[PDB]
Design a protein around this ligand. Structure first.
Ligand SMILES: [Mg+2]
Lengths: 79, 221, 224, 49, 313, 219
RNA sequence: GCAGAGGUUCUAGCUACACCCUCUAUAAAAAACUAAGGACCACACGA
């Protein structure tokens, strides 16, 4: 649970790019079987996504790199 | 330290009674007084009326012939009526009155276990000579105040919200006692205003037991 | 009664139509919740056909604002009543004095912010003694409409309903007078031609004081 | 006249009585104004809103 | 149908009536924190019915959505626990009917309460320009993850302390808490426990709560003042500063970074606004929010203790 | 009807050795405030603990003065001495004497034990001496008092904080069990001088309050 | 389970937002179940 999102807003300056990146992360959590790297403690997907952003473990660049890598294994799976 | 004891119990009247706790250190007396007042007001064993069944009327709003006031007024008067039961947590009281004259609480047919604390209390007035009211009063032992809506069958049965609060006001004043060779000792005096269902000393004992049981959660007995 | 009042409360109560005021002063031979009967004094009564005055107090009935109107008798048997005297207390009326609300002990002090700027804090004692419990009467009307594919029935039997809900209704399909109903329950059973049974609005919980059914001429009245 | 009315009763003429907190139990400093006031329940109930 | 207020533009295109909206009267609920608001159980049930149905299907309690609706109608125990799960971290928008400025609608993290009235945190009520007089606020529920995250990041009250119109904070104490702070931050020339030295704010609070020393009396106390002059670091300064017991008690509430000069004064409403502004500029948003909640609690408590009653005399 | 919901604490949160948080979830409607106020007032007004009440320094005999060669004023020294907390044995009163010279702080470790009495916090500082040649000599008096007795009510005198507690604040928050009306949840934050662990202090205060009520309950 | 019908119930149930199984022209061993449509103008009142 996060009362405020400041740590995120200095993690992501725009605070609207923050919404987009953390929304994509939470979408990956709900739709994909992937789970948040930071442990979940009775927290919804958006809250734990903001928590992951807070630690700096997740950002827009890292998220784009991760999805590109996942598409790479998707291509490699077909061979 | 010194442990207070129920040195004196004084009854200025049946409803109003005073209990005194003579030996108490500075600070202990006022803390104990506030705690006892809150415990007594919050929760005490009470025997207020729970449900009333009227032979002649189905619901509380409609009125019966020959009765001065509405059935709703009768129910709310019965709410004020208070009884004390010695051995039964549940009891049924039956009221029958015929002819002109007020229907007092004394007229209620009472078992050996259940006794009406205030016979002078009036439920209704039967103005018409050929008017008779038959009531089945259900009294349940309970704690605190329960609204009628919170609880829960026949259409004739009427539910009145019960108030198992035997004590109306509890006032305590801290006055210094006069021990032969001692200092900083004060006697706690609690003024109890109650409908009379619960004994004052018994109520103090129950409140003390409840507070002690609650404290036993904090530290092992 | 208002402990602090203008003094015009008596005038308002008397002049308002809710209060039943004796046409002719006299002694009350009989007083009842439904009606009050006055034995008129010999002087004030007419020389012929005066008889004795009878007043029928209206019981709990709906208002245009859904508030109960109830005249509670204000006099006892054998109590003399003078000319132009209040007989029974109408809504918000006590002893012929207009009593809109219940007055009570009031302390002016902030209390942990629970009364922040205009908020009001109320003791449990107020709820316990039913000082502000106000009877609200809501009228619900279900109308049998002549329609295509046959008129809609008033029968108790309804497709796809619980038997417990149908238990509250009578044989003819109308809830028993004096029954207790809650939100979602069916009061009167009506079936659309081929379902349309009237239902208690969600949240509303009360008892039915009375049920009145009006039927057009030429169509048979049901059992209820 | 109000002061005389209070003096007729046992109540203080000041109109302010020392009041004790229900929870803490310590009497409030600066004794508060306590008295009976007429209060009307408006039909604007919460459940309808 | 096109032009005018009744025209389709303003009626149904510019401002559209929306679903998942709940309306009820306002209540203070001082126990709530800044981001939390009271929300009735039935109101949250009605607003969050699709989420409840989805969670019921996921739990396997109801095989079909019709079964879930039947379960909700029964209002059985498991439905309440499901409602607790969805409400826990799902912001809802509290919105006063005339939305004069941007702060008119602000999200809150709902807390389920037994009742029928919405509780709004006292500090933000000044920002909402809302009294407690049959005032009613609409409650809209964000649905998508983008929406919930958007509300938490922006719409939430703790996120916007400063009003957009001016840099001055908008959650400034308004009626009761400001009065209590003023009562604490005052000096009486003679009062109980005057002229004694006190080890710290803890000892001041202990003396007041014991009642032997009066709330407002000039006493020399030792205070551990922290300075932000160090670059990204707090340095402790210990000194004996003449002050009242009330001010010393208030000092433990404020964060470390703020100096003692702000609390040393009488702390009128403008003074408290400046205090909050300095806290926002120095300590940051989160310490400012925590300090605002704590200061509201202390103001309420010490105003209740004061009993500042209005009287004819 | 005689039965009550008896609380079962879910956690005892501890931030430091001196400062701990205790919370009890179920309790009862209105019982939380009663218990919190009772415990708070009982452990402020009366707690078995020993603190410094009388001080004698050979340097000066007047409170509104400054000992030569000492950075701290004696009034500042009085405050630091008040802050000092000491555990004592069965004996009620013991006098401890120190004569220290040289530049450096006077640690609570450096005070002479002068008996089996032992100080809980050696790290605590009484005063600082600027001059090496200058020396400090103090007489310290401790009493097994019960509560906080100001010296104003009572040749140097210092207020005595006999009660080991420093700060306590009880807060009542709404709690529920299953589906039931609002029930108080009592959270108690206790800070002690260190002579006794805060949870042990709570248990001792509860035992004292129970002993006050042993007469009526009759087991 | 996507075009229809049948089945153990209760006229009808083929995903209609909608609940189970079968197949591409044939009807039953089987328990939880069912309904998706409707404005303006005036008055008064609260903010
Ligand atoms: Mg308003």
């Amino acid at each position: 649970a996060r009362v405020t999102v400041q740590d995120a807003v200095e993690k992501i300056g725009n605070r609207f790019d923050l919404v987009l990146v953390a929304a994509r992360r939470a979408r990956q959590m709900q739709v994909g079987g992937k789970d948040p790297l930071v442990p979940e403690e009775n927290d919804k997907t958006t809250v734990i996504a903001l928590r992951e952003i807070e630690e700096g473990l997740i950002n827009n660049q890292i998220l784009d790199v991760r999805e590109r890598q996942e598409q790479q294994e998707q291509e490699a799976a077909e061979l | 330290f010194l442990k207070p004891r129920l040195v004196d119990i004084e009854q200025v009247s049946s409803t109003h009674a005073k209990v005194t706790l003579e030996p108490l250190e500075r600070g202990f007396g006022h803390t104990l007084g506030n705690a006892l007042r809150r415990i007594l007001l919050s929760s005490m064993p009470g025997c207020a009326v729970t449900e009333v069944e009227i032979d002649g009327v189905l619901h509380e709003y409609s009125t019966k012939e020959g009765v001065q006031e509405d059935i709703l007024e009768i129910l709310l008067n019965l709410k004020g009526l208070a009884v004390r039961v010695q051995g039964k947590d549940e009891v049924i009281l039956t009221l029958n009155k015929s002819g002109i004259g007020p229907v007092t609480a004394a007229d209620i047919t009472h078992d050996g276990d259940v006794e009406i604390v205030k016979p002078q209390h009036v439920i209704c007035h039967l103005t018409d000579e050929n008017a008779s009211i038959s009531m089945r009063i259900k009294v349940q032992r309970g704690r605190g105040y329960v609204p009628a809506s919170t609880r829960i069958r026949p259409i004739g049965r009427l539910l009145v919200d019960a108030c198992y609060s035997p004590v109306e006001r509890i006032a305590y004043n801290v006055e210094a006692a006069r021990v032969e060779q001692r200092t900083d000792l004060d006697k706690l005096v609690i003024e109890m205003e109650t409908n009379g269902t619960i004994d004052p000393e018994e109520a103090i004992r129950r409140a003390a037991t409840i507070l002690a049981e609650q404290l036993e959660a904090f530290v092992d007995l | 009664k208002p402990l602090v009042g203008t003094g015009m409360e008596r005038a308002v109560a008397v002049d308002s139509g809710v209060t039943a005021v004796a046409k002719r002063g006299g002694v009350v031979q009989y007083v009842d919740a439904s009606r009050i009967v006055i034995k008129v004094n010999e002087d004030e009564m007419y020389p012929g056909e005066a008889g004795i005055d009878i007043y029928n107090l209206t019981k709990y009935t709906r208002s245009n604002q859904n508030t109960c109107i109830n005249q509670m008798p204000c006099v006892s048997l054998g109590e003399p009543v003078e000319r132009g005297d209040v007989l029974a207390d109408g809504p918000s009326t006590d002893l012929g004095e207009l009593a809109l609300g219940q007055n009570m002990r009031v302390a002016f002090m902030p209390w942990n912010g629970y009364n922040f700027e205009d908020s009001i804090l109320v003791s449990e004692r107020v709820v316990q003694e039913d000082r502000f419990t106000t009877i609200h009467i809501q009228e619900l009307a279900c109308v049998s409409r002549d329609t295509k594919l046959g008129p809609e029935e008033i029968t108790a039997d309804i497709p796809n309903v619980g038997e417990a809900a149908l238990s509250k209704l009578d044989e003819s399909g109308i809830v028993y007078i004096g029954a207790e109903v809650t939100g979602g329950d069916i009061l009167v059973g009506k079936v659309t031609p081929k379902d349309s049974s009237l239902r208690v609005p969600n949240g509303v919980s009360g008892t039915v004081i009375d049920v009145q059914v009006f039927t057009r001429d030429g169509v048979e009245k049901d059992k209820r | 006249e109000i002061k005389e009315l209070l003096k007729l009763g046992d109540l203080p003429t000041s109109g302010q009585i020392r009041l004790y907190d229900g929870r803490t139990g310590e009497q409030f400093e600066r004794p508060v104004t306590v008295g009976y006031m007429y209060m009307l329940k408006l039909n604007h109930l919460v459940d309808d809103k | 149908m096109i032009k005018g207020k009744q025209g389709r533009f303003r009626q149904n295109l510019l401002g559209k009536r929306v679903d998942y909206s709940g309306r009820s009267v306002i209540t203070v609920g001082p126990y709530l924190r800044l981001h939390q608001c009271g929300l009735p159980k039935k109101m949250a049930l009605e607003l969050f019915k699709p989420f409840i149905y989805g969670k019921l299907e996921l739990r396997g309690l109801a095989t079909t959505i019709k079964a879930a609706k039947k379960m909700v109608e029964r209002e059985e125990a498991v439905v309440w626990d499901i409602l607790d799960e969805v409400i826990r971290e799902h912001p809802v928008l509290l919105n006063r009917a005339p939305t004069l400025h941007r702060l008119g609608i602000q999200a809150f993290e709902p807390v389920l309460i037994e009742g029928k009235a919405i509780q709004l945190h006292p500090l933000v009520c000044a920002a909402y320009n809302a009294d407690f007089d049959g005032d009613q606020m609409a409650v809209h529920v964000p649905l998508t993850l983008e929406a919930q995250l958007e509300a938490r990041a922006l719409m939430m009250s703790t996120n916007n302390i400063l009003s957009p119109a001016n840099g001055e904070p908008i959650i400034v104490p308004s009626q009761d808490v400001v009065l209590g702070l003023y009562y604490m931050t005052r000096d009486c020339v003679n009062a109980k426990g005057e002229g004694m030295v006190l080890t710290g704010p803890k000892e001041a609070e202990r003396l007041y709560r014991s009642g032997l020393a009066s709330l407002h009396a000039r006493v020399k106390v030792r205070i551990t003042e922290y300075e932000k002059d160090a670059n990204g670091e707090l340095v402790a300064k210990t000194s004996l500063k003449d002050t009242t017991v009330g001010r010393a008690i208030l000092w433990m509430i404020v964060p470390k970074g703020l100096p003692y000069s702000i609390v040393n004064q009488a702390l009128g409403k403008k003074a408290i606004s400046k205090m909050l502004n300095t806290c926002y500029r120095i300590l940051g948003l989160k310490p400012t929010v925590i300090f605002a909640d704590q200061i509201m609690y202390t103001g309420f408590a010490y105003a209740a203790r004061s009993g500042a009653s209005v009287g004819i005399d």
